[PDB]
Design a protein around this ligand. Structure first.
Ligand SMILES: CCCCCCCCCCCCCCCCCC(=O)OC[C@H](COP(=O)(O)OCCN)OC(=O)CCCCCCCCCCCCCCCCC
Ligand SMILES: NC(=O)C1=CN([C@@H]2O[C@H](COP(=O)(O)OP(=O)(O)OC[C@H]3O[C@@H](n4cnc5c(N)ncnc54)[C@H](OP(=O)(O)O)[C@@H]3O)[C@@H](O)[C@H]2O)C=CC1
Ligand code: SF4
Ligand code: SF4
Ligand code: SF4
Ligand code: SF4
Ligand code: SF4
Ligand SMILES: [K+]
Ligand SMILES: [Zn+2]
Lengths: 95, 340, 43, 176, 156, 41, 360, 291, 208, 48, 114
């Protein structure tokens, strides 16, 4: 989900791009700007929300020791989903 | 004014001087010193090069990381120049050649390319444009060099009303073609001159002083639209100048006269070489041309540059031309030249 | 547990002493060969 | 507990004296050295045909740096700055801020490859296995500034070599 | 026509003869010198590619800067580089010669050898492996192959 | 004896090798550092 | 061509290691010791680890000690190969260099298999070692140790009996015992001049008092006796390697004090205490109690010592590195009195000098 | 503590609460130390934090969607031993081991709070209080703690002069300085005057006073009005807090006239509240019935 | 305290304490302090005037025989009025022991050279003079040994910055390797890693 | 990989690229952060 | 305040050492410009020597001026043999360094440094 500025230079996920009057664009003349197009926010926004049947849940990122430290998420709010702090997965109580 | 062009630091190698300069023909003689002086204050330098990158290797270590940007360009391609100068704020024009080749004549390198560069710098909104002409540029000059330089200087002035034109007299330095030419002529005989070389007056100028004048003209806001004349602090006749050159090199000095028509035929023979010619008729006519005096134009003293005489740098230039016997001779054991 | 281990009986023998072949003939054989070649060449 | 190297006195017997004279005159040990070199001529040379053959490596190898992601698209780094604090050469520069969905992510993550000593402390100080030191070693450049990696280059390296780093971590992670 | 064909063939010939006869000088300073002579070991054997050491700077083509360039070493490195006849090439080995490496903030270490000599190939690592140095040498050979010197002369 | 009566002011500015711009334009600050208020230590 | 004076100007590789060490933590200063002696790296790691463990009043597990001694013997093999082969290359015989550098490549493969780096492993750390050995490593070590005796045998056959090699070493650089003691010579110089001294037998460290081996002793102090002592040290290193392979204990490889060595990744992602200790060990580092100590081990070049002064914080106050190359190069001026150019390059070769550990 | 864990069961989880756009609250990390309640009940004097529940399920909070908005709402961030109450503008920006700490003086109010500016690579990151028992013992008002992000915004970076149209365009130092000097040389007497702002140092004030005195202009003014009847600014007694900031610790009767010290000098009001709580100060106000 | 606590050697501690008493009562003119650390290491802190007789006694006495000078350092502690501390490490092969001898000096008081006992002390105190500025009187050849040829200052003094005051780069105008004032592209980021909680109560200094 | 293929996700490159140094597709470094200090844009109105 | 000397008891002997060192340096300057092949005149080198001597003219403590005499003799011995290079000799002439601002106005224009 990359976005291009009116000058033709792409914008990274951090929002960095060069202005039209910036002299630092000359480093890209005759070469190319290395920008990663797999924006992580869009890919984590497409994960389905996991419906569980407990007040609390545990997340480890999948894979056990190959993931993040095991955190515990509370699901007492019926308005918002409980998002894991590391992997960004969101869980939701079915009641 | 942009935030990234504000100067920062103490003017060192890693500092930011706020100067974005495109120097044309930087792989030559003045270009080395100009890029060296620009890179040591921390300036963004753009080098468009026509030759091999291997010839730009020596220019590579002259500045910090990402401060020198090399790219290709052609003299007959305005789009490449538009690519080169679209982000710069100072453009410096040092394009020239001592001879005309099978592809470029004197009109191409002295009239067409400077006019194209100045036109595309004006169209790209570059505030400061600097053109390096010659001091003796005359429309009625004998050689095509000075005629084409005068025509190109007029074209640049008429197409860029805010252009600064710098007119050096004659540059001497480590990699010059003025003192080295005289010190290498000794191979072919006994240094022929025209009328014994006592009818022409020269005032050569050191390369570092020319570079300092160029840098100060970049920094000075009042140099926009001026036409400077960079000349040395002393005037010598040609005969005792060549005598001092050979006395520095500790070489036997046996001058002999040569007629003007006989010297032109000699220059015709040397200039048929497909490589760089050792000499030519244009070099002959410029060697035996008196340097004119223009008191109405500002000089190096108006830019705060103190002119250094030839006596303090001639040994540095010409020490490589001595034999083993005279390699370690000091500064002062050479009788200095006689001025006018 | 699983780890890198030596075998139950240990590893096999490993040499660490000098072993030079000390080949060649005796000196008398070499001298006799040389003298025989000399006399044959002389004749 | 010690041995007397080079304390062997010679033997004065006339037969061995004649043998030593024959060795002196006819150069026995010189022909011994010649024979050893001749026998060493007729062996298989140990030259591997680079680049068509590569030397052996281990799954613990320390090469080019890369940034990994979770198996859903989310990048693994959480801007905890442990790698930049454990780095012995100060080659890591991190600047962080919360992004649009309130997740603790980086905005700047630079590794200076010309300062990095390739000791692998960052890949073992990372609590989420985000930064890894992959198996790539043929990445020499023609310019100094091409060896100054920013976050986009590290993420591109991670996406380029994930199929190998995942298998190497799977093979090795029970020792760490 | 014919002149461009002739100068292209001559460029190809001289580029092959220069890239297949690289003679580096015996020059090392530190850990990376041990890795360079491990590249010269029988496992990798750079002598296969025509790459053979020549100790004198006058008879060498490529200079390999392997080690840490201190302040006491920089004039010697610059002088030895100047005495090497044209054409000459420089390969940077390790992080010390690239940007100072471990000792970047040291008071007596030149931050990268590119401040002294013009460097063609930068080989990263600490130490870069023998395969990595062989890769850098092959990259320098491929860079030499892409030279158009007589083409540039004919066009100018 | 072998002891010299020395009464002049002690200085080693000419031996440290620091340039003058970092010796007469600087300003040293001597202080007990304040406690980090995030912690009670 | 007769030498009248030698003045070795050094400091061309002075990186100023022992100031940047003071500016960094102990784990950050650990890779600095690999690059002093870049051909005896793991022994330097062992010396630094032993000094820090002595200051911290903790000890490694037995398996870490046995791994340390085995890999120190492997590093001694590497160093002695390079020393003998480079000395022969300086003299003029270049075939053993290419002959034994294949074996050097094999031990480099062992280093990369156990640590992930060919030379600068950063494997031996205060508290033990960083990682356990991968499966199947010791069998390949066993095969290499099986063939290395024949490799040393063919090197010795091509060198030790050649009269051209003998003429360049029999009466070159003769050092008496008293001047060897007075000039601070240590290791192979002392043992070749007749001094029965070894740090592995007299002041033992981790498990060197449980393995048995012999010590070569020279008789004339020349280059020939020192070369023979190096060859015998290689053979005894093979003997110790076999002894360590046969007697490897099971168990852990780090000290179980989790406030010094970092915990495993399985418990760092499970336990709160383990994660807290991982954070504070990889950010601040462990606090070493105040004190000054001097720990010296028998590196292949001789007595390698670290003088460590700690002020109670997480960073060292002072670290001084004593390398045998400094004293050997100081004695080079006396050792070359009354010799020639080829004799002085022989004396340079018989002193195994790496200038990283000399210039620091 | 010890070096490893014997716990093997599931950890608890506490629902996070919202108390305002200044303090980020993650109550899974709270250890129920009850410094929140004590600070809000004794020093802030708000009485809005409490402990609802019993046993392991006790939660420190407000029990409703109420925003803890007082003038001293960053000190609960300061005195939380864990990361439960963190700073919302500072969130996920830096780490404590890399910030350079420089001791400075707050100029937001007239109290003169001693602070520490912690920066990172020439960039102001956060402002912390300093221990000084005579002014701001270990607290500061939240304006002091959170004015830095506006300090780094809308800045004047280049000298600007009016062009031929009448718009401020950027120029060099020399041109603008020459224009100001050329205007200054043409005025003499009461044709030139100066106004001081609210964040001006004494160095700039004395430099401007001397420069205007070289042209014989004594008309120098400040934005705040003070009556000059009688002695005026001659004696230092009639325009100073003559006792001390900490002089209210010993006093027993105070009388405030026409002031709101809760929003003028919040630490002076905090010290007055502390004297009222401990030494039983008697407080009376003349003015509007503010809280 | 069996597996993870380093065992102590009480026999070595007692023997080294006995020898410390022996040395301190043999030479009462110079010995100021004698201390044995918890890992059985002896330190004999003496007066700087008695450098040469203490080392001569340790080298030549029949009951000491400390024939080897293992290592000789210098440590800078700026808060003392004698900011430089010179440390000698000696090894006795006959009795198989190591002893440490510490002395003190400031920048202007010369120290007597110990080349008359051990000849490695020549290069050792030459390096000490190079890195700290401690002048060693009656020295045969005292010059610089590690620093640059035109280097001014002593790098290992604690008031010397980590990066020096100059740096070297090649200039093409003079065709020379010239030295300029330093300008780092990225500054050395100083880290504050001291914990504000006391770790070891045994080393607690008394208050004022 | 014919016998044991690696695990495939949705972000791994489907087209490998060799060393691109010296080519127009080489990597150029840049700062990945936004502006740090905002600057006071002057008004576009007459001041009388 | 009685302290150990270095070489001279009082300032007269230290001045004698300074004078002898400066005599030897003044002798050495022609050989220095000859062997190292500098492009400066002998007068320029002698003015540089005089300026380097005048840079330490305000110090009156015998021990520190003895130490400077020791350092100057060390540098003289370093230059007597060819241990310096051309660059080490010409590092006393800061030709590559640009001239710094001196007055208040140029320092105010160039940056925030005092
Ligand atoms: C007017 C008409 C004439 C015009 C003038 C030109 C006349 C001919 C000039 C000489 C030949 C020019 C062409 C040179 C080769 C061009 C093609 C080329 O570069 O091929 C590359 C190939 C090796 O490929 P590489 O990239 O090295 O692969 C790595 C290994 N996997 O290379 C190879 O596989 C081998 C290349 C061999 C090159 C030719 C053989 C050497 C030169 C012989 C002639 C010159 C010398 C004569 C004797 C001189 C005295 C000794
Ligand atoms: N004698 C002197 O030194 C004096 C010179 N001048 C003027 O100063 C200028 C610089 O002179 P100088 O440096 O000494 O001379 P050089 O010949 O050494 O350098 C000229 C530069 O121009 C480039 N150039 C030449 N022809 C072309 C072309 N057709 N297209 C593109 N680039 C081209 C060259 O690059 P490449 O190597 O690729 O060909 C080179 O970099 C000239 O204009 C000259 O007239 C003025 C007064 C005195
Ligand atoms: S491998 Fe080591 S030196 Fe390199 S970035 Fe990681 S921690 Fe830093
Ligand atoms: S250690 Fe890992 S999670 Fe932490 S900042 Fe570094 S890469 Fe990111
Ligand atoms: S880059 Fe690393 S391996 Fe190479 S010399 Fe430097 S420290 Fe040694
Ligand atoms: S100060 Fe922190 S730990 Fe204490 S009650 Fe408040 S949130 Fe909980
Ligand atoms: S840093 Fe402190 S408050 Fe935060 S999770 Fe760790 S122990 Fe809890
Ligand atoms: K908090
Ligand atoms: Zn998760």
């Amino acid at each position: 989900g990359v976005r291009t500025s009116p000058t033709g230079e792409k914008v990274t996920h951090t929002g960095q791009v060069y202005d039209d009057e910036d002299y630092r664009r000359v480093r890209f003349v005759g070469r190319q700007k290395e920008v990663n197009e797999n924006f992580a926010i869009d890919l984590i926004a497409e994960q389905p929300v996991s419906q569980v049947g407990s007040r609390v849940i545990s997340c480890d990122g999948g894979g056990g020791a190959l993931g993040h430290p095991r955190v515990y998420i509370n699901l007492d709010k019926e308005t918002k989903t409980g998002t894991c702090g590391y992997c960004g997965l969101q869980f939701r109580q079915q009641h | 004014l942009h935030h990234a062009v504000i100067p920062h630091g103490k003017g060192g190698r890693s500092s930011v001087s706020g100067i974005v300069a495109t120097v044309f023909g930087a792989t030559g003689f003045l270009g080395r010193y100009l890029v060296n002086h620009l890179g040591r204050m921390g300036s963004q330098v753009i080098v468009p090069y026509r030759c091999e990158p291997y010839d730009t290797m020596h220019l590579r270590p002259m500045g910090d990381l990402g401060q020198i940007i090399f790219m290709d360009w052609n003299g007959r391609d305005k789009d490449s120049i538009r690519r080169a100068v679209e982000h710069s704020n100072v453009v410096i024009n040092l394009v020239g050649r001592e001879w005309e080749t099978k592809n470029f004549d004197f009109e191409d390198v002295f009239v067409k390319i400077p006019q194209a560069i100045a036109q595309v710098s004006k169209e790209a909104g570059v505030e400061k444009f600097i053109h390096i002409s010659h001091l003796n540029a005359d429309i009625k000059s004998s050689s095509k060099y000075l005629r084409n330089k005068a025509v190109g200087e007029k074209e640049v002035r008429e197409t860029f009303p805010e252009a600064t034109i710098i007119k050096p007299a004659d540059i001497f330095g480590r990699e010059d073609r003025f003192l080295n030419y005289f010190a290498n002529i000794r191979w072919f005989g006994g240094v022929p001159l025209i009328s014994l070389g006592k009818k022409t007056v020269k005032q050569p100028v050191y390369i570092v002083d020319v570079t300092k004048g160029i840098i100060n003209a970049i920094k000075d806001p009042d140099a926009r639209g001026k036409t400077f004349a960079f000349v040395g602090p002393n005037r010598y006749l040609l005969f005792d100048l060549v005598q001092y050159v050979f006395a520095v090199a500790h070489r036997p000095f046996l001058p002999y006269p040569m007629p003007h028509f006989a010297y032109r035929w000699i220059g015709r023979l040397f200039e048929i070489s497909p490589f760089e010619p050792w000499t030519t008729r244009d070099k002959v006519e410029r060697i035996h041309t008196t340097d004119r005096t223009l008191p109405h134009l500002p000089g190096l003293e108006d830019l705060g540059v103190q002119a250094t005489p030839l006596e303090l740098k001639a040994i540095e230039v010409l020490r490589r031309h001595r034999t083993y016997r005279w390699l370690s001779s000091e500064i002062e054991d050479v009788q200095p030249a006689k001025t006018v | 547990v699983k780890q890198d281990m030596p075998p139950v009986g240990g590893y096999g023998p490993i040499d660490y002493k000098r072993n030079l072949p000390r080949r060649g003939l005796s000196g008398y054989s070499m001298f006799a060969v040389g003298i025989g070649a000399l006399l044959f060449g002389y004749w | 507990t010690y041995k007397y190297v080079n304390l062997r006195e010679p033997s004065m017997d006339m037969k061995s004296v004649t043998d030593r004279a024959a060795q002196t005159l006819l150069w026995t040990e010189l022909i011994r050295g010649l024979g050893m070199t001749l026998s060493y001529l007729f062996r298989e040379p140990a030259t591997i045909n680079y680049p068509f053959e590569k030397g052996p490596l281990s799954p613990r190898f320390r090469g080019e740096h890369a940034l990994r992601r979770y198996p859903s698209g989310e990048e693994r780094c959480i801007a905890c700055k442990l790698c930049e604090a454990v780095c012995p050469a100060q080659a890591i520069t991190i600047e962080a801020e919360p992004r649009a969905d309130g997740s603790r992510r980086t905005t700047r993550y630079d590794i200076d490859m010309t300062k990095c000593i390739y000791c692998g402390f960052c890949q073992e100080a990372c609590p989420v296995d985000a930064i890894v030191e992959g198996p790539n070693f043929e990445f020499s450049t023609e310019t100094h500034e091409e060896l100054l990696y920013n976050k986009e280059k590290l993420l591109n390296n991670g996406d380029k070599w994930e199929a190998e780093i995942a298998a190497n971590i799977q093979a090795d992670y029970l020792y760490r | 026509s014919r002149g461009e064909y002739v100068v292209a063939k001559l460029d190809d010939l001289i580029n092959w003869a220069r890239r297949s006869s690289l003679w580096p000088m015996t020059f090392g300073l530190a850990c990376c010198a041990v890795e360079m002579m491990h590249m010269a070991a029988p496992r990798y054997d750079m002598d296969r590619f025509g790459v053979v050491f020549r100790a004198s700077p006058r008879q060498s083509d490529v200079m390999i800067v392997a080690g840490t360039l201190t302040n006491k070493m920089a004039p010697a490195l610059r002088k030895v580089y100047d005495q090497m006849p044209e054409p000459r090439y420089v390969v940077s080995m390790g992080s010390c010669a690239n940007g100072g490496g471990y000792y970047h903030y040291s008071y007596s270490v030149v931050r990268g050898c590119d401040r002294i000599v013009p460097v063609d190939i930068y080989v990263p690592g600490c130490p870069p492996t023998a395969e990595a140095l062989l890769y850098g040498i092959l990259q320098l050979q491929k860079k030499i192959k892409r030279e158009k010197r007589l083409r540039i002369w004919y066009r100018r | 004896t072998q002891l010299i009566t020395v009464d002049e002011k002690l200085d080693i500015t000419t031996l440290t090798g620091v340039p003058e711009e970092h010796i007469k334009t600087r300003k040293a600050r001597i202080f007990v550092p304040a406690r980090n208020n995030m912690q009670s230590g | 061509e007769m030498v009248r004076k030698c003045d070795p100007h050094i400091g061309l590789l002075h990186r100023g290691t022992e100031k940047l060490i003071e500016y960094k933590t102990y784990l950050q200063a650990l890779p600095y010791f690999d690059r002093l002696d870049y051909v005896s790296m793991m022994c330097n790691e062992q010396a630094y680890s032993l000094a820090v463990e002595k200051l911290l009043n903790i000890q490694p597990p037995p398996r870490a000690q046995w791994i340390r001694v085995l890999f120190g013997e492997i590093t001694r093999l590497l160093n002695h190969i390079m020393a003998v082969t480079t000395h022969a290359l300086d003299i003029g015989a270049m075939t053993p260099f290419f002959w034994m550098f294949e074996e050097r490549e094999k031990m480099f493969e062992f280093y990369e298999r156990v640590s992930g780096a060919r030379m600068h492993a950063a494997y031996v750390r205060p508290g033990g070692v960083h990682q356990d050995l991968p499966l199947g490593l010791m069998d390949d070590i066993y095969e290499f140790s099986k063939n290395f005796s024949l490799r040393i045998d063919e090197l010795e056959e091509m060198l030790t009996n050649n009269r051209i090699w003998r003429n360049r070493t029999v009466d070159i650089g003769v050092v008496t015992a008293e001047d060897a003691l007075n000039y601070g010579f240590s290791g192979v110089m002392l043992r070749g001049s007749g001094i029965q001294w070894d740090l592995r037998k007299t002041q033992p460290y981790d498990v060197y008092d449980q393995v048995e081996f012999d010590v070569p002793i020279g008789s004339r102090g020349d280059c020939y006796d020192r070369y023979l002592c190096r060859v015998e040290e290689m053979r005894q290193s093979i003997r110790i390697i076999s002894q360590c392979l046969n007697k490897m204990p099971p168990g852990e490889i780090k000290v179980d004090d989790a406030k010094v060595s970092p915990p495993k990744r399985a418990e760092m992602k499970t336990s709160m205490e383990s994660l807290i200790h991982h954070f504070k060990l990889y950010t601040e580092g462990y606090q070493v109690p105040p004190g000054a100590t001097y720990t010296a081990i028998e590196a292949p070049k001789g007595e390698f010592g670290v003088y460590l002064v700690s002020d109670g914080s997480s960073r060292p106050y002072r670290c001084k590195i004593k390398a045998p190359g400094f004293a050997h190069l100081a004695g080079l001026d006396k050792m070359s009195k009354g010799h020639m150019l080829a004799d002085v390059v022989a004396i340079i070769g018989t002193q195994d000098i790496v200038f990283g550990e000399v210039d620091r | 503590g010890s070096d490893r864990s014997r716990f093997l069961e599931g950890k608890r989880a506490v629902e996070d609460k919202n108390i305002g756009p200044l303090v980020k609250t993650i109550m899974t990390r709270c250890i129920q130390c009850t410094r929140c309640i004590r600070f809000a009940s004794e020093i802030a004097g708000v009485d809005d934090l409490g402990t609802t529940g019993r046993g392991n399920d006790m939660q420190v909070g407000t029990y409703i969607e109420k925003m803890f908005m007082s003038e001293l709402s960053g000190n609960i961030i300061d005195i939380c031993p864990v990361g439960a109450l963190t700073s919302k503008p500072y969130a996920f920006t830096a780490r404590p081991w890399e910030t350079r700490k420089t001791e400075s003086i707050d100029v937001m109010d007239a109290v003169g709070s001693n602070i520490v500016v912690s920066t990172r690579t020439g960039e102001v990151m956060r402002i912390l209080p300093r221990m000084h028992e005579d002014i701001n013992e270990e607290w500061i008002s939240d304006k002091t703690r959170f004015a830095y992000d506006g300090l780094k915004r809308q800045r004047l970076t280049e000298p600007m002069v009016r062009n031929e149209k009448g718009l401020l365009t950027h120029t060099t130092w020399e041109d603008a300085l020459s224009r100001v000097a050329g205007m200054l040389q043409s005025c003499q007497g009461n044709d030139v005057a100066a106004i001081a702002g609210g964040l001006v140092d004494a160095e700039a004030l004395i430099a401007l006073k001397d420069l205007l005195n070289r042209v014989d202009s004594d008309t120098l003014c400040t934005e705040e009005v003070f009556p000059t009847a009688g002695a005026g600014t001659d004696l230092r007694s009639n325009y100073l807090l003559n006792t001390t900031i900490a002089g209210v610790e010993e006093a027993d009767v105070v009388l405030l006239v026409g002031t709101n010290p809760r929003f003028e000098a919040p630490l002076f009001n905090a010290r007055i509240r502390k004297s009222w709580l401990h030494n039983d100060l008697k407080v009376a106000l003349i003015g509007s019935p503010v809280d | 305290t069996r597996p993870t606590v380093r065992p102590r050697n009480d026999v070595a501690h007692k023997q080294l304490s006995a020898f410390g008493e022996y040395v301190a009562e043999i030479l009462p003119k110079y010995v100021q302090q004698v201390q044995v650390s918890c890992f059985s290491e002896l330190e004999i802190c003496i007066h700087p005037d008695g450098v040469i007789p203490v080392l001569t006694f340790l080298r030549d006495h029949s009951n000491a025989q400390f024939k080897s000078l293992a290592d000789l350092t210098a440590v800078d502690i700026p808060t003392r009025q004698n900011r430089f501390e010179i440390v000698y490490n000696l090894l006795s092969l006959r009795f198989n022991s190591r002893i440490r001898v510490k002395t003190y000096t400031d920048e202007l008081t010369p120290v007597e050279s110990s080349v008359s006992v051990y000849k490695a002390a020549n290069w050792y105190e030459r390096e000490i003079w190079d890195m700290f500025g401690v002048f060693f009187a009656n020295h045969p050849d005292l010059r610089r040994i590690l620093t640059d040829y035109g280097f001014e200052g002593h790098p290992f003094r604690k008031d010397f910055p980590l990066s020096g005051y100059v740096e070297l780069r090649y200039d093409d105008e003079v065709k020379r390797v010239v030295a300029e004032p330093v300008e780092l592209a990225q500054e050395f980021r100083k880290f504050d890693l001291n914990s504000p909680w006391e770790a070891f109560p045994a080393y607690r200094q008394p208050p004022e | 990989p014919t016998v044991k293929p690696p695990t495939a996700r949705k972000f791994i490159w489907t087209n490998h690229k060799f060393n691109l140094s010296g080519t127009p597709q080489q990597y150029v470094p840049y700062s990945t952060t936004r502006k740090k200090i905002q600057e006071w844009v002057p008004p576009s109105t007459p001041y009388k | 305040t009685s302290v150990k000397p270095i070489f001279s008891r009082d300032m007269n002997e230290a001045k004698r050492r300074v004078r002898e060192l400066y005599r030897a340096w003044y002798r050495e300057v022609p050989n220095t410009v000859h062997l190292f092949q500098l492009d400066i005149s002998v007068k320029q080198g002698r003015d540089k020597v005089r300026e380097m001597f005048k840079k330490n003219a305000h110090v009156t403590d015998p021990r520190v001026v003895d130490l400077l005499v020791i350092k100057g003799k060390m540098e003289l011995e370093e230059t007597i043999n060819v241990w310096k290079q051309r660059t080490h000799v010409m590092r006393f002439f800061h030709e590559t360094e640009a001239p710094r601002p001196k007055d208040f106005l140029s320092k105010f224009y160039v940056g925030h440094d005092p």
